[PDB]
Amino acid sequence: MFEVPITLTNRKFAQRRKLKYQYINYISRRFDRISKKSSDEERKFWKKYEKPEKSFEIWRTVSSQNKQPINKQKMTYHNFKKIEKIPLRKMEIPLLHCTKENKLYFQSISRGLEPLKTSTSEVRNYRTRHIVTLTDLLHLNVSRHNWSLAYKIFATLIRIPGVQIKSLWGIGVEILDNLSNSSSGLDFLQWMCQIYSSKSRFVQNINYRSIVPPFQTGSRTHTAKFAITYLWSSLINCQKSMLIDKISEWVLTPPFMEDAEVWFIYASCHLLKADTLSRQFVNRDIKINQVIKHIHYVRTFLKICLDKGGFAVPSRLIENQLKSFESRLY
Template identity: 40%
Template sequence: MFELPLVRNTKRVRTVRKLRYQYINTLYQEYRRVQSSATANSTLPTPENSAAEEASDGDHDSADATSRRRRRKRRLLSVLGHAETDTDLSDAEAEEGNDDAEQADSEKEFFTRHEKPQETFEVWNTDRQKTVPMNTSTLSYDTCKQIERRAQKRLSAGMGHISKNADQHFRAMRDGYEIVAETPESHHLAHITQLNELLHVNIMKGRWDIAYRCFSILIRLPGVDIRSMWGPGARILRELSSTDKGLGTSEEFLGWLSGIYSSRSNFNQAMNFLMDPVFRCGSKTHTAKFVVAWLWELLFASCPDGTEHFSEEDPSNRKLLRLIERLSEMVLIPPYMEDPEIWFIFAVCHLVSADQLSQRFISTKSRTSELERDISRNQVTQHITNAHNCIRTCETKKGDFSFPRRIIEEQLACFEKRLYQNNDDLTASDPESEFGLGNEQENLDTQNVLGPGMSSMIDEEDNFFGSAEQVHFGFDSDSST
C-alpha cells in the first residue's frame, strides 16, 4: 500500500540502465545518419578538395596519422568480427572521439535531447515565421532493422564482461518485452512491509505513540534507508517532543541527517553499488530536502515568542545568531550557493534580526546614550542591507522560486523607520501616524539634514508605500501597536 523505505539498486540494475541509454543514443545516431544521407542524395553533390589541394595546405602528416589509425581500427574490428562493411567501419571511426563521453554521460546525453516539462508548460508558439513543417518522412522495415543491427554491433564490443543475468535483462528490454520486477518473499521484507503500513496508518489517525514505536524499530532494521522516511519521523518528533522532554526534537533529527549524509562526501561507484536518488540524498548541484526543512525548522524556532523586550540571554535570539553564522558559511560552498531558497531563508533571518534589534532600540532609547543609539542603528541598518543583498542574490539564481518581494521591502522600510520615530509616534493609535515622522526629530547629519530646494521623501499623512495598513510577514513586526 505504501512505498517501502528501501533502495533496490544492484550492480545488475545499474549495468542494464547504462546499456539502455547507450543503446537508445546509438539508435538515435544511426537514425540521424540515415536521415542525413537521404537528404544529401536529394541535393547536388558538393565537390571535395583534391589530394593536391590538401597537400598544398600542409596536411600530409595529419592525413597519414589518421589513415594509420583507421587501418589499425579496421584490423582490430575485423579480428573481433564486429565489422562487416565499410559503412560500419566509417561509423565507428566517426564516433571514435566520443566513445569515452558516451560511456560516462549516456544518461545525460539522452535527457539533453528532451525539453523539460517546466519549460514547455502552457507555452504556445503563435509566430508563423517560426513554424516548422511536419516531418512526414517514413522508414521502411528493412531500414529500421538495419539501424537496429548496427546499433547492436556497436554495443556488443562493450558487453563481453557483463554478467549473464544483466545480458538477459538487456536483451529482453531491447526486444520490447516487459520485465517483471522481482518480489523476494522473506520474513525480513514482510516485517518491514507490516511496520511501514502501521507507521503510516497511525500517523493518519494521530496515534503518535504507536507511530513512534514503529518508526524507532524501522530505522534500526538493516536495509532500511532513513532518508526515505525523514518526513514522517520529523512530524512524529514534533508532536511528541512538546510532551516528552526526553525525546529528541525534529530540529535535532534533521540536523543529524544533514551532518551524517553530506552532499560533499565521496561516493565510490566501483565499491558501492547502491546509488541513491538525487532528490533523496542531495548532490553537489542539488540541495537535499531534509537540509532545507532543517533550516526552516531552525528559523521558526529562533523567531521571537511575542515578548516585548529584546534580551541577549533569550534562547531564541542565540539560536538566530547561530543560524545566521551557519548560513553565512553554507552559502560559500555548492550546492547551497546556487539554491535560491537558501538565500531566501538567509534574507528572512536578517529580517527577523532587524525586527528584534529595532524593537530593542525603541524600548531602550530613553535609557541609552547617543553613542549606544548610533551603534544600535548601525546594527539594524546592517541587517536591512544584508536582507536586501540576499533578496537580490535570490532573484539572480536559477530556479522557479517566487516570493513576495514587495511585502518584505515594506517590512524592512518599516523597521528602518522605527529608528527615527519618537515615543509619542510609536504609541499613537492611528495607523497612519505609525508610519509618519514625529515633530521632534533628532539632528542626524546622514538622515535629516536636507539641502536647499530638497523635500523630504516620506509623506507626513501616509506611509512610505502609499497604503494606510501595516503589512505583517508571518509575525508581529511591531509589538507596541
C-alpha cells in the same frame, strides 16, 4: 504499495535493463543515420542526457529561447517497420542467452506493453520482506494521524540492516508532530546534515541505484533538502520561541556560493531581528544604530539573492517591510 528503501539487486532485473538499454542503443543509432539521410550499454546511454540533480525532471521554462519549429514530417508504419528490423535481427542473439521470462519480457516491451509486476514484489528474503511490510505500515499510520504508533514503526525500521536515507528523514514529522516527549524534530535534522552533508561533485557518469538526488543527496550545486529544511525549521522555531544570533552566526558559516535560497533565509534571519529590535518600548543611543545594520543586511542579502539563479522573491513587499521598520525608528 509505497516505496521501499532497499538496495535490492537481482540477476534477472540486472539482465532485463541491460537487455533493454542495449536495444535502445541500436534502434537509436539506426535512427541516427536514417534521420541524417533525409561501454556498459547503459552508461553509454546516459552520456546523451543530463541528470537533473535538483528535481526529478529537468524542467525547462518555455517562455524563453528554447523555441523550435515543428517537425511536421511524421513517422508512419512504412518507416517504422524498417528502422526496427535490423536492430531486432541484431538483438535476436542475446535473447536466447537470457532467461525464458526475460526473453518474453523483452518481446513484450518491444511493442509498448508495460510490466504489470513490480521488481520489489517477489524479493522473498524474510528481511526485505519485513521491510516491505514495515514501510507500507509506516506510510499508512502516518496517513491515519496515528503518531504514537507510527513512532514505534519507524524506530524499528531504522534498525533493520539495509534501510536507507529515503524513509529516514522524510517522515521525521513524527518527532515534530508528536510533542508529547518529542526530541523537538529539529535535532534529527541536525543529525542528517552533519553526516550526509557532502561536498562531492555529482559525478553523473555512474548508473545510480538506491540513491536518487532530489531528496536524499547533498552534492555541490545542490544544497540537500534536509539542509534547507533545517534552515527553515530552525527559523520558525526561532520565532515561535519568543538564539536568533546562534542561527544567524550558523548560516554565516557556510557561504553557499551557488544557490539563492540560503541567501534569502540569511536575509530573512536579519529581517526578523529588525522586527524584534524595532520595538524600543519607550513610553536610545545604541539601539538605533544596531537596527540600521540589520536593515542594511536585508537590502544586500536580498540583492545577492537576486544575483544568483532563479528564486523569485517578492522584492517589492520586503522593501516595504523595511520602510515600516524605519517609520518605527524615524
